[PDB]
Design a protein around this ligand. Structure first.
Ligand SMILES: *[C@@H]1O[C@H](CO)[C@@H](O)[C@H](O)[C@H]1NC(C)=O
Lengths: 128, 48, 97, 128
């Protein structure tokens, strides 16, 4: 059992920056990898970024690559999403997720069902 | 003594009345403890 | 050990090495978690393309196929050395006449 | 060379019975043991039951044990699979198989590659 709490969402102008946090509580020794997903109103959920808990290595979807940085603090039990150069497409509800599952191929974490989800935090990108 | 990897301990207790001189008497030491160690021993130190 | 090492949702506590530069020697134990360099590019402890984590979990669910169900295995290897044989069998007695 | 022809598959309700036959033709003096295997759509092939041709002794996988009876007719050159108390999991294509290999441990026949295979017969178990 773990519970996930997102924070740091809100309004920002296109070309600007935002920092999402997600705090893990419960059986945290069981975290293998973490992910961020997003879902705009009326369109399906979409993988954003994943990080392996040991090692810290990151996988990103093509739409965010070079704009977004996933990172973790093992000590503080928290995953971060540094969103820079915000765009139209970024507007959505963002969910963090945890899996207890070790996959060799980091890319697996794009498609692999996660074990627990946050309630979500809203991001909204203003029109110039 | 350590022979064929067996540590063999032989012991006796006798009441004595000499402080400095090693007491002169005949005693036979009965075996008590045999250890299947297979450990090479070339040195030892006493603990007090 | 399906009754013990499987649970609803899948038990992923049991892992296995998926990649290695060479085969193991008899009774060799490799517990390293070094990032496997599949290609020519050094990984420098960073996962990515041709840079994979060497280990991977088992999917042990109670509903899994017998082939994929967990099995507990003990291998007994009998050391014989130039040292006293200390592990012996029971050597059963008979009545005295 | 031998050829194997399964028969007696089809539809039946869960808790009911079915009898698969498999007729051996060709060099039949060479049969050491026979087996039944099954394969549901989209899952891997799975050992069901084996019988030694001489002796008639049977080995079963745990999933079918006490529900299924393997048996042989040396004279008629045919292996039978008596499927009783049919369940959800039983639904699959069933294959009979022959090996010319004598293994001391009957259990070997669960894991040991067989020499020839039938085309297969479909079994389907209705929902109550
Ligand atoms: C004990 O010491 C001798 C001399 O060094 C050596 O040849 C022998 O291999 C040793 N045996 C053990 C039990 O290590």
């Amino acid at each position: 059992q773990v519970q996930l709490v997102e924070s740091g969402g809100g309004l920002m102008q296109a070309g600007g920056s935002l920092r999402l946090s997600c705090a893990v509580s419960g059986r945290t020794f069981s975290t293998a990898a973490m992910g961020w997903f997003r879902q705009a109103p009326g369109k399906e959920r979409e993988f954003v970024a994943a990080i392996r808990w040991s090692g810290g290595s990151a996988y990103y979807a093509d739409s965010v690559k070079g704009r977004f940085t996933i990172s973790r603090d093992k000590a503080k039990n928290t995953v971060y999403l540094q969103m820079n150069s915000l765009k139209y497409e970024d507007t959505a509800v963002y969910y963090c997720a945890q899996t207890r599952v070790t996959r060799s191929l980091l890319s697996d974490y794009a498609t692999w069902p996660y074990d627990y989800w946050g309630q979500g935090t809203q991001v909204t990108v203003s029109s110039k | 003594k350590n022979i064929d990897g067996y540590f063999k301990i032989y012991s006796k207790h006798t009441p004595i009345n000499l402080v400095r001189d090693l007491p002169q008497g005949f005693s036979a030491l009965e075996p008590l403890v045999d250890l299947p160690i297979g450990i090479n021993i070339t040195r030892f130190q006493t603990l007090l | 050990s399906n009754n013990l090492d499987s649970k609803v949702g899948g038990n992923y506590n049991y892992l296995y090495r998926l990649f290695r530069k060479s085969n193991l020697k008899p009774f060799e134990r490799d517990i390293s978690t070094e990032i496997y360099q599949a290609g020519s590019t050094p990984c420098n402890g960073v996962e990515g393309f041709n840079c994979y984590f060497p280990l991977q979990s088992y999917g042990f669910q109670p509903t899994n196929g017998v082939g994929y169900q967990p099995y507990r295995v003990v291998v007994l290897s009998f050391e014989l050395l130039h040292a006293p044989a200390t592990v012996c069998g029971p050597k059963k007695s008979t009545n005295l006449v």
